């Protein structure tokens, strides 16, 4: 069994700027490309299953939980429910100038517990392979680092691949998330052809990914910096309590001020 | 003692610890274990014993005197639980320094 | 070196990547327990969030 | 409570005659070693 979760960075600031920029690629066509991927993923195998989540600066919403047009109800209903659910998010959304960073950690969290719920509801007669495809486009936030790291290790622990399909802004932690989880990361230069990357690079699952040739992952710069200056450094002094990278020795660590002794 | 001869040279910031999976309640010893226990306390080596089908005196005193814990396998789930619990970092004792 | 984190074979110093440290920060940020509500308690959210 | 982030631990296991005993369902030596492989991996996975 294969479970594919698609995460769309539906941030209205970036996509709105692109609309104001008269960008060729747009969120609608992006959601439509996601729709084709979701359909084609399920279309690939009877046991294939999927979920879709979109994120907004305020919150994230799930897009997925007769034959009047002569076609299968599941595909047709999946298309309609996804369109209706995305429109509800876009229409039912507040406006706030102070908050613009896109939510990602909360979206991945819901996906992981959803996958875990599915991992329990699935019959033990069959094994379920799960993957998360993150479609990032707008800027990340430093506050998300801690929470994003939590979900990254949970996904690794629970063997979920994080596949990153970046549109514009390249999050250093996102390119780390895939590498830590063994997922792929790519930034598309030709946003209008995003669907080709999805079907060629992101469509194949781990079993297919192994038996196939794909561009090697981009080198990941695992930067490290002291919490006092946030400057990249090769040597940092941590403590067995705060475990925080300090710039230099101090009798008291500013985050805790515990009574360290000179040495 | 073999562990102590190794853990004694370890730095002070690192939590030195030993996990003992005790199976046969009888154990031969070349010297009084109480001296070694006192040495373990002084060496700040955290010792915790897990006894299988046995509730041994030396393991009881060794653990509780050193500050560690001595537990015995109730069943497979208890064994799984005890090892899972030991994966947690040790809570810092009032005698422990940073 | 091919594998991290590891202690220096020469300097006797620990080499590690920043995510490995964050892997322990859950110990520093213990999660607060959620209050139990086994009864429905008229919660209109039929679906678990 | 404060927690010791970095820790060095030695696992002591008996190799005595009682390890061959089928004290649990599987052979005690097999059971303990099999579960220790899990514990060893989890030890690094959490620290």
């Amino acid at each position: 069994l294969n479970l594919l979760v698609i995460v769309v960075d539906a941030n209205p600031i970036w996509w709105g700027k692109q609309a104001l920029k008269e960008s060729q690629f747009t969120l609608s066509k992006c959601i439509d490309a996601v729709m084709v991927l979701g359909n084609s993923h399920l279309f690939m195998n009877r046991s294939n299953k999927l979920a879709v989540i979109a994120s907004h600066i305020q919150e994230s919403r799930f897009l997925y939980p007769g034959s009047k047009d002569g076609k299968y109800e599941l595909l047709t209903s999946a298309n309609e429910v996804i369109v209706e659910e995305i429109k509800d998010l876009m229409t039912k959304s507040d406006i706030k100038g102070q908050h613009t960073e896109t939510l990602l950690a909360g979206s991945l969290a819901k996906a992981l517990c959803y996958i875990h719920r599915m991992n329990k509801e699935v019959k033990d007669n069959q094994e379920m392979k799960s993957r998360i495809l993150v479609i990032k486009a707008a800027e990340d936030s430093a506050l998300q680092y801690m929470n994003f790291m939590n979900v990254i290790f949970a996904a690794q622990k629970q063997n979920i691949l994080i596949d990153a399909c970046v549109l514009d802004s390249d999050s250093g932690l996102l390119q780390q998330a895939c590498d830590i989880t063994g997922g792929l990361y790519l930034k598309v230069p030709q946003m209008p052809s995003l669907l080709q990357y999805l079907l060629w690079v992101f469509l194949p699952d781990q079993d297919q990914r192994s038996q196939l040739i794909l561009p090697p992952p981009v080198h990941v710069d695992y930067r490290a910096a002291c919490f006092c200056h946030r400057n990249l450094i090769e040597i940092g002094y941590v403590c067995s309590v705060c475990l925080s990278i300090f710039c230099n020795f101090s009798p008291i660590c500013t985050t805790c001020e515990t009574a360290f002794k000179i040495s | 003692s073999i562990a102590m001869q190794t853990l004694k040279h370890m730095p002070g910031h690192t939590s030195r610890e030993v996990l003992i999976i005790f199976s046969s309640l009888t154990t031969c010893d070349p010297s009084n274990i109480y001296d070694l226990i006192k040495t373990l306390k002084a060496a700040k080596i955290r010792v915790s014993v897990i006894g299988l089908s046995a509730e041994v005196r030396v393991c009881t005193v060794l653990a509780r005197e050193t500050g560690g814990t001595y537990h015995v396998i109730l069943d497979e789930s208890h064994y799984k639980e005890l090892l899972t619990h030991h994966v947690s970092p040790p809570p810092a004792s009032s005698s422990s320094e940073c | 070196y091919c594998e991290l984190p590891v202690e220096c074979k020469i300097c006797g110093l620990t080499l590690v990547s920043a995510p490995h440290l964050a892997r322990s920060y859950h110990h520093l940020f213990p999660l607060d327990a959620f209050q139990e509500i086994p009864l429905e308690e008229y919660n209109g959210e039929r679906f678990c969030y | 409570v404060r927690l010791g982030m970095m820790r060095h631990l030695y696992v002591v296991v008996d190799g005595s005659r009682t390890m061959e005993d089928q004290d649990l369902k599987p052979n005690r030596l097999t059971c303990t070693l099999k579960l220790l492989e899990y514990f060893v991996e989890e030890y690094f996975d959490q620290n």
Binding site: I13, K17, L20, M149, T255 | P91 | - | R2
Partner: peptide
Amino acid sequence: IALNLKKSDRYYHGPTPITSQD
């Protein structure tokens, strides 16, 4: 020894470094 903290927000970022009409 209970857990103590003075500036915990710094942990949220780690090494990570740092129009209204639009």
